[PDB]
Structure 1
Amino acid sequence: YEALRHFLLMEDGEFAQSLSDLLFEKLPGELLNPLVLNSVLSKALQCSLHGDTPHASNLSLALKYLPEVPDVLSCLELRYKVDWPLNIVITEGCVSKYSGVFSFLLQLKLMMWALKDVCFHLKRTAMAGSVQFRQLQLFKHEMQHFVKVIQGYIANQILHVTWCEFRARLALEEIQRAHAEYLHKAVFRGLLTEKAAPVMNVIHSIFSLVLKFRSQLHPNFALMQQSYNTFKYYSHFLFKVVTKLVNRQPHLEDFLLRINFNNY
């Protein structure tokens, strides 16, 4: 469990931080052969001094669908397999939900990649001071705080509070039930549930807008100001929609912590 966790909820650092950065240089016509996608995970493992395991074997990176390649959608699975007497406890239905949440967390890493890109693209233009420069960098710092608060919500819920349990929940059927409950709470706190689906609907707008801000590179300052204003409006509307669902969730309460700490 604490082996598969490192790969499918990314508890191994500078493995995710080395996988994602390399993957996003491509995005395609590339990433179709199993010689670069199968080796980039092996490249990510050596930057973290982890591996030489029977968990390192049966690591299969694969796409569930071929790319049709802004587009903020992608598919990517990472699959781990076991043999016969442990197949009955860890099934093919649980690992499917593990690959479901892993894609979600990787797409969250795409955010801190893209804002890092714009930070670097601004770094190469950073000499002489002007108004456009400071008023431009506030967009980057602004979006960086917002991705840090949604990342911190994930960083507390699926990553800390649900991991304290399932360390004595095991103490033959009970193991299957405990594993399924732990995974069910992981997909429950991920807000991929249909009750919390309208919150997830707001997430795509923010994701698309910061990918738009990446695309723009002072040639067109007012365009960037307009996109910034729409971003601020969507973040303002998120505060209302998460407030409305308090009347009709203990796991969402932490969300109300992060998006609401000082300045309405």
Structure 2
Amino acid sequence: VLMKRSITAPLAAHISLVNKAAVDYFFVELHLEAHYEALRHFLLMEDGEFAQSLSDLLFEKLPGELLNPLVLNSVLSKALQCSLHGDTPHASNLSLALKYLPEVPDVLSCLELRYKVDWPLNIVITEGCSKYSGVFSFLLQLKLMMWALKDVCFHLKRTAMAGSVQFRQLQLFKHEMQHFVKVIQGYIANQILHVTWCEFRARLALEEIQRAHAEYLHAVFRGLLTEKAAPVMNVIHSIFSLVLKFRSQLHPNFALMQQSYNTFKYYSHFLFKVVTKLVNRQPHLEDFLLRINFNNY
């Protein structure tokens, strides 16, 4: 018999003590549990009064402006003051940099927001886990709707005497278009911030930390950013684009807007079919149809 017990027995007794002392060293001394619940406050825009203050500032402008480090590198230092949560050593290291020079109605404004760490934490949070910047540019793009759409809701308020069929029939479009954005956002605020955070919070409590984190963010699957369900994402742009055109025409050109809304009701009616056909082939998408459809077809 060849039972190798004289080696592993004085060995395994010491392996568990090192690892348990290695992981414990991270939490009770370097606050690994804090960094996660802090980057979410800033990157994933979980903390209100911050995204509602950052995006609200940038959207006030819209080329050569809004691109030099004198405004965008300073709008952040003005944003954190209006956060009412932060201004800690964690709150720094928010390099609000860019990765493209835009030339000149669309729904795109490319801009990154990268966290920064130091040595004993950089070895765990990978310099590729760059994927937050992938999920961030989507979430910011969503805010562009709930502000521009809020504008036309506020732009129309000052128009009020002027009560006729042309007026009331117009405002029903906004309530019909806003509700679609306020439900797709309610979905995002359920998958990428609450249930995917239930896991990886009751999951943790050294190699595992790398994989557990690589499984938490891999937030990009329930976020409709994966190339597998990409056609579901392509249709979203057609919706977001038409709302932007609806903002341009702030009744000299009513009919020009009436055609726009009819294009909106068609595309939305097409989404409900493309998601249904993609159920036979993903339990994450299952909750979407229950969100987009409720007492309708």
Q: Is the 8 A contact 1:55 1:80 kept in 2?
A: no
What are the residue-to-residue correspondences of 1:1-264 with 2, within 5 Å? 1-94=36-129, 96-184=130-218, 186-264=219-297
Alpha-carbon distance between aligned partners in 2 of 1:59 and 1:119, rounded to the nearest angstrom: 33
Q: Is the 8 A contact 1:63 1:77 kept in 2?
A: yes
Alpha-carbon distance between aligned partners in 2 of 1:7 and 1:130, rounded to the nearest angstrom: 46
SS where residue 224 of structure 2 aligns?
Answer: coil
Deviations 1:4-33 (A, max 9, x none): 011111111100111111111112222112
CA drift of 1:52 comes to 2.4
Alpha-carbon distance between aligned partners in 2 of 1:109 and 1:175, rounded to the nearest angstrom: 32
Q: Is the 8 A contact 1:29 1:69 kept in 2?
A: no
Deviations 1:103-136 (A, max 9, x none): 1000000010110111121112123311111011
Alpha-carbon distance between aligned partners in 2 of 1:201 and 1:236, rounded to the nearest angstrom: 15
CA drift of 1:213 comes to 0.4
SS where residue 37 of structure 2 aligns?
Answer: coil
Cα distance change on mapping 1:128 and 1:70 into 2, 3 Å = closer
CA drift of 1:71 comes to 2.1
TM-score normalised over the length of structure 1: 0.96
Deviations 1:57-110 (A, max 9, x none): 21100111011112222211001111112111012100x101111110000000
CA drift of 1:242 comes to 0.4
Gaps in structure 1 of 5+ consecutive residues: none
Alpha-carbon distance between aligned partners in 1 of 2:79 and 2:290, rounded to the nearest angstrom: 34
TM-score normalised over the length of structure 2: 0.86
Identity %: 100
Deviations 1:153-210 (A, max 9, x none): 10111111101011132231101111110010x0101111111100001001001100
Gaps in structure 2 of 5+ consecutive residues: 1-35
Q: Is the 8 A contact 1:213 1:224 kept in 2?
A: yes
Give aligned pairs, total.
262
Alpha-carbon distance between aligned partners in 2 of 1:29 and 1:140, rounded to the nearest angstrom: 33
